[PDB]
Ligand binder design. Structure first.
Ligand SMILES: *[C@@H]1O[C@H](CO)[C@@H](O[C@@H]2O[C@H](CO)[C@@H](O[C@H]3O[C@H](CO)[C@@H](O)[C@H](O)[C@@H]3O)[C@H](O)[C@H]2NC(C)=O)[C@H](O)[C@H]1NC(C)=O
Ligand SMILES: *[C@@H]1O[C@H](CO)[C@@H](O[C@@]2(O)O[C@H](CO)[C@@H](O)[C@H](O)[C@H]2NC(C)=O)[C@H](O)[C@H]1NC(C)=O
Ligand SMILES: *[C@@H]1O[C@H](CO)[C@@H](O[C@@H]2O[C@H](CO)[C@@H](O)[C@H](O)[C@H]2NC(C)=O)[C@H](O)[C@H]1NC(C)=O
Ligand SMILES: *[C@@H]1O[C@H](CO)[C@@H](O[C@@H]2O[C@H](CO)[C@@H](O)[C@H](O)[C@H]2NC(C)=O)[C@H](O)[C@H]1NC(C)=O
Ligand SMILES: CC(C)CCC[C@@H](C)[C@H]1CC[C@H]2[C@@H]3CC=C4C[C@@H](O)CC[C@]4(C)[C@H]3CC[C@]12C
Ligand SMILES: CC(C)CCC[C@@H](C)[C@H]1CC[C@H]2[C@@H]3CC=C4C[C@@H](O)CC[C@]4(C)[C@H]3CC[C@]12C
Ligand SMILES: CC(C)CCC[C@@H](C)[C@H]1CC[C@H]2[C@@H]3CC=C4C[C@@H](O)CC[C@]4(C)[C@H]3CC[C@]12C
Ligand SMILES: CC(C)CCC[C@@H](C)[C@H]1CC[C@H]2[C@@H]3CC=C4C[C@@H](O)CC[C@]4(C)[C@H]3CC[C@]12C
Ligand SMILES: CC(C)CCC[C@@H](C)[C@H]1CC[C@H]2[C@@H]3CC=C4C[C@@H](O)CC[C@]4(C)[C@H]3CC[C@]12C
Ligand SMILES: CC(C)CCC[C@@H](C)[C@H]1CC[C@H]2[C@@H]3CC=C4C[C@@H](O)CC[C@]4(C)[C@H]3CC[C@]12C
Ligand SMILES: CC(C)CCC[C@@H](C)[C@H]1CC[C@H]2[C@@H]3CC=C4C[C@@H](O)CC[C@]4(C)[C@H]3CC[C@]12C
Ligand SMILES: [Mg+2]
Lengths: 363, 884
């Protein structure tokens, strides 16, 4: 018969009509401006006191000498807030390796840098890569979520799977299933990093860098130890220098307790890849000169790509990036400027708020 | 199965919602503009995918990048296709199902309205079509009907002519029309009129209580107010006037064709049934006069009154025929206009009867339903000719004409009626509201045109300052009608407007959208209209003439005539037309309009079934057009650009990731964000806006009806607004992508512990958070009123985004996050990016809105400022000016 009631069947809900009167806009454009400038300065000040050491060593094999020599100013970038003019050009030294027959990348780059300040109790040494394309469509889908999960997936489950499957690197010419399959695991950054920052001045106390805990612990709930039988799997086409005899009863890598692999199996979204490779969560890194021994294996000059180390204590908003503070300050300043312009319009020429004589029919 | 299930189940729930609120083919204009906007969105998608394919090919034909070392022109085609698969949510089927949900909800909200439900006959507003509700918010023309829509079709006997003398006392609406047209103070004499009718009816009811036991029903149906007849029938002229009024009462109580059968369920109440209301009014006013009809019978009319017994068997009943409107029947002792009975006289006798003819002119003053009753009062010859003429040959017409010409000449008048049809409760206020809203309403009246214009002046369709361009062109007297109608229309168009031109003005008015200025009035009759809509040039000429502000009356119209009028105003000069009406002719009038409202009036519900809406009284159309119409129109006009903007803000953001990655075809978002964004993340806020957003309260939208002029002028929804929302979506997508990227761009270690974000899925979480928050806050910014339901559901949509990221990632089935929520939502970098990204998405739009509500504020901004100040605060919740 008759309709219902209560203020819902009839659109009579308890509402709030937001009339943007100048007595509510200005208390909003200012409450937003001061908040976005307070956080705009709090972030930019927190970001300013962030030490950072970037050292690109992609040109260490063909531009460094057997003796110590300063790194060209185009590679390294030091940013210490306590020392704004701390050039202190770090040195490097390339010791070749005639045993290794990989001419494109071999030997060892020893980089001696000098930090004039400490890094509080949590030092991250990532490796940065440039001009390495790890975000392409065929690449990022080139892995098997069955081998990562620890299953001994056959060639059908590994190759004939859904969009996420190792299409170009499913099986070798012999007939084995690459255990870490796909362009992702195959193309892994294999430059070996030291487990301790060699102290140049006082070699009695070396700053130890562990490789455990460099990835999320939850990742160990997804990357599980394999269940293969070393008779069906072969190293990826580029892991054949790490496993020249293929696989046997022992040398099968445990991807659960191999956090560099789990870091690399997370493809970098952009053209610059920066993945954590060494961490120190116990000791503050004291000021002084330190040497890092990187075993050059991963070639980058073939595609003009760059590779380097990135040492930092970090921050709460990540590393040192003058964007969040800058954009917060710009947002606050824009809010304040537009509010001043609105106050000018309301003062230097405008209507009464509820001006009934300004309606189109009252003209 | 969870692939494409939600579509079918929502189709079923929409169908069952349509089939639930209905038991107790016409597409709107917004839908066609929606199709065009979808075409434009597809053009944007094609441009995006073409640029993606071009840049991907250029990259593949470039320097030896890192592709050919670690990854091992049909390449352009496959890149274009994977881009189409990437950028495909620009315009999905979600728009065409969300719009249907919106229209269904708006229709069931029109239905469930309590101020549109008529408790008299228990019939709420039942939308016969659930797809045209925004069509009501842009209605420009209303083609009403005087039959039973404006007037309640309840005939009331007011005056009469006994012995050539007028008897009766009633103040009709046409008298008020004369008083308003001549310039008398109307709406003021009503007070003293009521105060005198009070004592008049008081003495009336005292006379009834002192006369008899009043065996009739309760005094609510005692429509007898004219005491003058009862005063003069007793002793004014002695027994002469008594003899005349008794003869009149007998002629009206025995000569009739009403089918009386008092039953269902008690024989106490009367069940007088007749196809014509005039006979029912006559027998009712003869019963209430004092000559009631107690009891019932099958054969004959046995009437006992205080001792007198009346049963005069006629032995033959002459039913009313619609072609001739005449029957020769004289009652033994032991019907239309003057074109059938009059105009046949001796080309010096019967002068007093001629005086009675002048009474017709007095009946032309008030415009009632009148007729003449002339009976001719040696006895054996009468019954002999009766029985020999009752069995004539060839349909009984030749001998009937013979006798009607030889003996039925120069009759004497002994009867005459006068019946009025008053407007429904709240029709003048409704017309005043629809006129203030700028709706040019046409009245397709019926029988008489003089009464039509008088009633139009009685209601608020006619008023002062108007120019009554009378186009009743039937001849020189007040030769061929075509040329004189053409000359009169041209003279009016030339001397009342500056309209030197024929064809250019039609296109000029089509590109004008309609603005009624300079209140005028036009009146057409049957023949002048049937000659006005046939010629192609005459059609546009009459249309340019009838583009006046409010008053366009059309009398003596046929069903096809009014249908063709609605077609002429609809097809030519394309506008939105409403055709409220009731009856069989109004069926054809309705079926050929943009919106057709049907009044549940007479027994025939044909105009209710074959319509779009069905209201009880005519007044409801105001609330159907001024409140619900404008509401749904602005709701759709905001939703559609909101929808396209919220799709752009996501697709363009997925495209911006193609700058990097060289448009190779990798998704920035997870495979399940691409679906849940348009399905669950940002779908409910915009729908609840388009369903529950109120421009202003119903009281404010009826107090300031001129707000409706935003729909008549199409000032709310246009392609400019859609393009502006799409450009805002492009900019906001730029922000939504490049704020998380610029957070990452420096060192890519924005994770608060260096453990490592920057899987493209996590940057996608960043971007999707910014985009979902900006979309919901945008829907809330552009919502006129923030209520307990839409704001709650915007908060709940944000919570759904967050909670389902937390549910999907905290499960091994995600296969690439496994911790995306616990890894992204926990870093302060994420919230720091999100807050400033939302600020930079909402700041330029909110600022342009502020500098618009300050410099060039629309009429709704001013009305809302007044409505917040507390102008419209003296009115209750459910207020409507259309009520007694
Ligand atoms: C570290 O990772 C490197 C990732 O590319 C990897 O480089 C690849 O090494 C393989 C050899 O193992 C090269 O393949 C060469 O040798 C085969 C032998 O049949 C030839 O058929 C090939 O044509 C080619 O000459 C790859 O070309 C090379 N890839 C690149 C981009 O240089 C290193 O081998 C890895 N080193 C260690 C120690 O793990
Ligand atoms: C610290 O790291 C040193 C790296 O050079 C290394 O000490 C050795 O290996 O090298 C020193 C310089 O070449 C030399 O002075 C030491 O005698 C070397 N020690 C040994 C055992 O051969 C050690 O790894 C670290 N040194 C200490 C003292 O812990
Ligand atoms: C499995 O293979 C690995 C390497 O392919 C073997 O490790 C080598 O062992 C020999 C002698 O035990 C050493 O001389 C090499 O230096 C080792 N190489 C490396 C890289 O560690 C391992 O011994 C093999 N295991 C079995 C059981 O045969
Ligand atoms: C920081 O201290 C922790 C223990 O307090 C070290 O963790 C141990 O590391 C050694 C060396 O790899 C392992 O053999 C132990 O099994 C680890 N213990 C635990 C409980 O994990 C960690 O290596 C130290 N980090 C640094 C950089 O010195
Ligand atoms: C209200 C508007 C005008 C504020 C705009 C702020 C502008 C003028 C300032 C604020 C931050 C500045 C930018 C800071 C960083 C960079 C990156 C550098 O590689 C090129 C210059 C560039 C791009 C600067 C250009 C100018 C800049 C964008
Ligand atoms: C120095 C040269 C090589 C830089 C060019 C980089 C190219 C590949 C990238 C960087 C900026 C990108 C453009 C950014 C803006 C737009 C406008 C948009 O509506 C269409 C895509 C388009 C036109 C993009 C096309 C691809 C683009 C031009
Ligand atoms: C007309 C109403 C309905 C919608 C208005 C859309 C307006 C508010 C939107 C759409 C396009 C947007 C602009 C897109 C581009 C830029 C350039 C940038 O450097 C400043 C912001 C600015 C100028 C935006 C301001 C806000 C903007 C103009
Ligand atoms: C300062 C250096 C690092 C920038 C190098 C990348 C430059 C060349 C490319 C990458 C991203 C590109 C921008 C992507 C987005 C937009 C917004 C669009 O509406 C206009 C083009 C514009 C503004 C592009 C300009 C060129 C651009 C900034
Ligand atoms: C291009 C016309 C139509 C509108 C102008 C909008 C300009 C002024 C605004 C809108 C979006 C803004 C861009 C947003 C993101 C980036 C990418 C960053 O790496 C360089 C700055 C840059 C490129 C900004 C430059 C200024 C910008 C392009
Ligand atoms: C006390 C230690 C162990 C907590 C470690 C987890 C911390 C760092 C994470 C987990 C939950 C996160 C919070 C989740 C919600 C918000 C509310 C937002 O408006 C400000 C950021 C803030 C407050 C986040 C800050 C960082 C946070 C507190
Ligand atoms: C507009 C506002 C809400 C942006 C929010 C920025 C938040 C998420 C970021 C910016 C600065 C960050 C804070 C920086 C410093 C500290 C002090 C430390 O002892 C506890 C964590 C705490 C408190 C961080 C919490 C998260 C934080 C407050
Ligand atoms: Mg009707």
């Amino acid at each position: 018969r008759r309709p219902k009631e209560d203020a819902f069947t009839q659109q009579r809900l308890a509402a709030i009509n937001p009339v943007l009167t100048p007595r509510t806009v200005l208390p909003l454009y200012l409450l937003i401006a001061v908040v976005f400038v307070i956080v705009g300065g709090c972030i930019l000040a927190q970001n300013s006191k962030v030490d950072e050491v970037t050292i690109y060593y992609q040109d260490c094999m063909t531009n460094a000498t057997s003796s110590w020599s300063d790194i060209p100013s185009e590679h390294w970038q030091f940013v210490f807030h306590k020392y704004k003019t701390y050039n202190t050009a770090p040195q490097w030294r390339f010791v070749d390796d005639e045993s290794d027959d990989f001419t494109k990348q071999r030997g060892t780059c020893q980089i001696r840098f000098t930090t004039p300040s400490d890094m509080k109790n949590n030092v991250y040494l990532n490796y940065v890569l440039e001009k390495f394309a790890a975000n392409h469509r065929r690449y990022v889908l080139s892995f098997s979520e069955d081998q990562i999960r620890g299953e001994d997936a056959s060639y059908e489950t590994v190759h004939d799977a859904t969009g996420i499957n190792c299409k170009p690197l499913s099986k070798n010419a012999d007939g084995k299933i690459y255990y870490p399959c796909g362009l992702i695991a195959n193309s892994m950054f294999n430059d070996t990093f030291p487990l301790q920052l060699t102290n140049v001045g006082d070699t009695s106390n070396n700053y130890s860098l562990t490789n455990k805990g460099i990835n999320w612990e939850s990742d160990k709930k997804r990357y599980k130890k394999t269940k293969y039988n070393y008779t069906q799997i072969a190293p990826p086409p580029y892991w054949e220098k790490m496993y020249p005899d293929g696989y046997n009863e022992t040398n099968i890598p445990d991807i659960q307790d191999w956090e560099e692999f789990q870091n690399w199996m997370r493809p970098g979204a952009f053209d610059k890849i920066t993945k954590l490779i060494r961490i120190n969560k116990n000791d503050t890194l004291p000021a002084g000169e330190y040497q890092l021994d990187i075993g050059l294996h991963w070639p980058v000059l073939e595609f003009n790509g760059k590779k380097g180390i990135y040492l930092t204590h970090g921050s709460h908003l990540g590393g040192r990036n003058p964007f969040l503070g800058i954009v917060y300050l710009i947002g606050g300043c824009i809010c304040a400027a537009m509010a001043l312009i609105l106050l000018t319009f309301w003062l230097f020429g405008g209507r009464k708020i509820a001006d009934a004589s300004s309606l189109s029919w009252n003209m | 199965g969870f692939a494409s299930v939600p579509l079918i189940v929502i189709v079923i729930i929409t169908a069952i919602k349509d089939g639930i609120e209905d038991s107790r083919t016409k597409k709107s204009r917004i839908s066609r503009e929606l199709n065009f906007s979808v075409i434009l969105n597809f053009v944007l998608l094609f441009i995006l995918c073409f640029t993606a394919g071009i840049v991907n090919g250029v990259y593949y034909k470039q320097k030896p990048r890192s592709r050919d070392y670690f990854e091992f022109s049909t390449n352009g085609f496959v890149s274009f296709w994977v881009a189409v698969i990437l950028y495909q949510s620009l315009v999905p089927i979600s728009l065409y199902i969300s719009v249907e949900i919106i229209k269904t909800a708006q229709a069931i909200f029109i239905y469930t309205d309590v101020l549109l439900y008529n408790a008299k006959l228990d019939y709420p507003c039942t939308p016969k079509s659930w797809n045209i509700s925004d069509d009501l918010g842009q209605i420009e023309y209303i083609f009403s009907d005087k039959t039973g829509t404006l007037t309640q079709n309840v005939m009331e006997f007011k005056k009469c002519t006994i012995n050539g003398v007028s008897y009766g006392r009633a103040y009709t609406e046409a008298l008020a029309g004369l008083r308003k047209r001549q310039g008398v103070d109307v709406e003021s004499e009503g007070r003293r009129e009521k105060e005198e009718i009070a004592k008049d009816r008081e003495t009336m009811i005292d006379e009834l209580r002192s006369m008899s036991d009043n065996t009739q029903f309760c005094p609510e149906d005692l429509t007898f107010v004219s005491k003058e007849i009862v005063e003069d029938l007793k002793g004014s002229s002695g027994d002469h006037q008594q003899k005349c009024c008794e003869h009149f009462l007998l002629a009206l109580a025995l000569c009739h064709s009403v089918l009386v059968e008092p039953n269902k369920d008690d024989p106490k109440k009367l069940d007088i049934k007749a196809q014509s209301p005039d006979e029912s009014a006559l027998v009712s006013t003869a019963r209430q006069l004092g000559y009631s009809f107690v009891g019932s019978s099958k054969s004959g009319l046995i009437v006992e009154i205080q001792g007198v017994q009346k049963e005069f068997q006629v032995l033959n009943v002459l039913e009313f025929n619609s072609s001739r409107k005449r029957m020769s029947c004289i009652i033994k002792i032991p019907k239309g206009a003057d074109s059938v009975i009059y105009s046949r006289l001796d080309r010096n006798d019967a002068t007093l009867l001629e005086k009675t003819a002048l009474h017709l002119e007095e009946y032309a003053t008030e415009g009632l339903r009148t007729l003449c009753l002339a009976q001719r009062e040696e006895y054996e010859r009468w019954v002999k000719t009766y029985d020999v003429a009752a069995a004539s040959v060839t349909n009984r017409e030749e001998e009937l004409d013979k006798v009607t010409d030889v003996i039925e000449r120069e009759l004497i008048l002994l009867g005459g009626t006068a019946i009025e049809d008053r407007l429904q409760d709240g029709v003048p206020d409704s017309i005043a509201l629809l006129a203030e809203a700028g709706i040019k309403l046409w009245v397709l009246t019926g029988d008489k045109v003089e009464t039509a214009i008088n009633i139009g002046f009685s209601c608020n369709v006619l008023n002062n300052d108007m120019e009554l361009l009378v186009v009743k062109a039937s001849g020189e007297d007040v030769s061929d009608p075509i040329q004189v109608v053409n000359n009169l229309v041209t003279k009016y168009l030339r001397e009342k407007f500056g309209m030197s031109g024929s064809e250019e003005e039609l296109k000029e008015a089509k590109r004008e959208h309609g603005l009624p200025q300079g209140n005028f009035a036009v009146i057409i009759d049957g023949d002048a209209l049937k000659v006005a809509l046939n010629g192609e040039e005459m059609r546009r000429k009459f249309l340019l003439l009838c583009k006046n502000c409010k008053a366009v009356l059309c009398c003596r119209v046929s069903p096809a005539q009014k249908a063709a009028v609605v077609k002429l105003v609809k097809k030519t000069l394309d506008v939105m037309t409403l055709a409220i009406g009731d009856g069989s002719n109004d069926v054809a009038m309705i079926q050929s309009a943009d919106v057709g409202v049907g009044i549940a009036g007479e027994e025939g519900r044909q105009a209710v079934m074959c319509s779009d809406y069905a209201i009880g009284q005519f007044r409801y159309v105001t609330r159907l057009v001024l409140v619900h119409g404008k509401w749904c129109y602005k709701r759709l006009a905001e939703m559609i650009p909101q929808f396209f903007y919220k799709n752009v803000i996501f697709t363009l953001s997925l495209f911006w990731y193609g700058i990097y990655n060289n448009f190779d075809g990798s998704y920035l978002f997870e495979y399940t964000y691409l679906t849940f964004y348009n399905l669950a993340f940002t779908s409910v806020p915009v729908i609840l806006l388009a369903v529950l957003d109120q421009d202003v309260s119903d009281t404010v939208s009826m107090l300031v009806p001129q707000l409706y002029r935003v729909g008549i002028l199409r000032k709310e929804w246009n392609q400019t607004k859609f393009l502006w929302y799409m450009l805002d979506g492009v900019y906001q997508s730029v922000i939504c992508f490049f704020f998380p990227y610029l957070a990452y761009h420096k060192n890519m270690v924005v994770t608060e512990n260096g453990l490592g974000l920057d899987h493209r899925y996590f940057v996608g979480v960043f971007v999707t958070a910014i985009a979902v928050t900006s979309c919901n806050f945008y829907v809330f910014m552009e919502q006129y009123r923030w209520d307990w339901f839409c704001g709650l559901f915007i908060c709940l949509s944000l919570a759904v985004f967050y909670g389902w990221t937390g549910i999907w990632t905290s499960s091994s089935s995600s296969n690439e996050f496994y911790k995306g929520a616990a890894r992204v939502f926990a870093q302060p970098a994420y919230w720091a990016v999100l807050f400033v990204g939302v600020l930079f998405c909402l700041l330029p739009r909110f600022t342009i809105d502020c500098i618009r509500k300050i410099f060039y504020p629309k009429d709704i901004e001013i009305v809302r400022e007044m409505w917040l100040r507390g102008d419209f605060d003296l009115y209750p919740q459910g207020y409507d000016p259309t009520d007694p």
